[PDB]
Amino acid sequence: AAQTNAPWGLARISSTSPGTSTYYYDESAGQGSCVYVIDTGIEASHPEFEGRAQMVKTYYYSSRDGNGHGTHCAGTVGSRTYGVAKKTQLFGVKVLDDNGSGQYSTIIAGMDFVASDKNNRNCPKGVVASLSLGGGYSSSVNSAAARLQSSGVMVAVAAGNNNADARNYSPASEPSVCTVGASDRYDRRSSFSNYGSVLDIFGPGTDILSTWIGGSTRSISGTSMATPHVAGLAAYLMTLGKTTAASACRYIADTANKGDLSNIPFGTVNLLAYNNYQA
């Protein structure tokens, strides 16, 4: 398939060179897979989700996305115009309030919930989880992320927006989950993106147009926007049978565009998410 005039991030992960405007991808588009978006929620009512999004857990007086952040990430995973896995199923776990804040004990609870709740859902091509969130170092948070990975779920987490080493943030610093850095449309490391040996892969994360609450759309920036590209990609590759939940992050790194990013510090991988689709 080809999406003409796609967002630059979608075109990037299906291209070998920056500057293109078409997203090339297999028509399966993630059908049969499931991506849990652990964030401020999702506006499942958005016509861009085509009824494929549904909230399954909240920890606040409401399960609605009063922020847009979670709706923006979910649209990059699987929205029809802005997503990587356009036929995937999106589940919303609202661990963050409408300021984008959330306590560690709640985020942990959310992750434990996803490990259990995938057993209630039909996902014959596997399960992905996208955690566009984090904070200071916490081993309990890291264990939580590793528990989720070990239970059969592909975990992708943002590396952080502190332009520092991700060793000091969580769950970004958990070795067994996929930790995603951010790049821009010119293959530069995003000015804000964290770095460090704990990174596994980079995805598009500067000026990312995607869905927004109110049935709208906007462009924003962060390793929060890079994470759902890789999560979408994981789910896309899993539907195709090329990798598994346990093996996807390694697969994405093996098959990534190598050595094409600028400003990548010494010790940080130089790998850009890439779907190697050959029509």
From Swiss-Prot:
Top EC class of this enzyme: hydrolase
Highest taxon of source: Eukaryota
Listed name of the protein: Proteinase K
Cofactor(s) named in the record: Ca(2+)
Disulphide bonds in the chain: 34-123, 178-249
Keyword Signal applies: yes
Portion held of the full protein: 106 to 384 of 384
GO molecular function: metal ion binding; serine-type endopeptidase activity
Residues reported to bind Ca(2+) 2: 16, 260
Job of this protein: Hydrolyzes keratin at aromatic and hydrophobic residues.
Record-level GO BP terms: proteolysis
One Gene Ontology cellular component annotation held by this UniProt entry: extracellular region
Chain sites annotated for binding Ca(2+) 1: 175, 177, 200
Annotated catalytic residues: 39 (charge relay system), 69 (charge relay system), 224 (charge relay system)
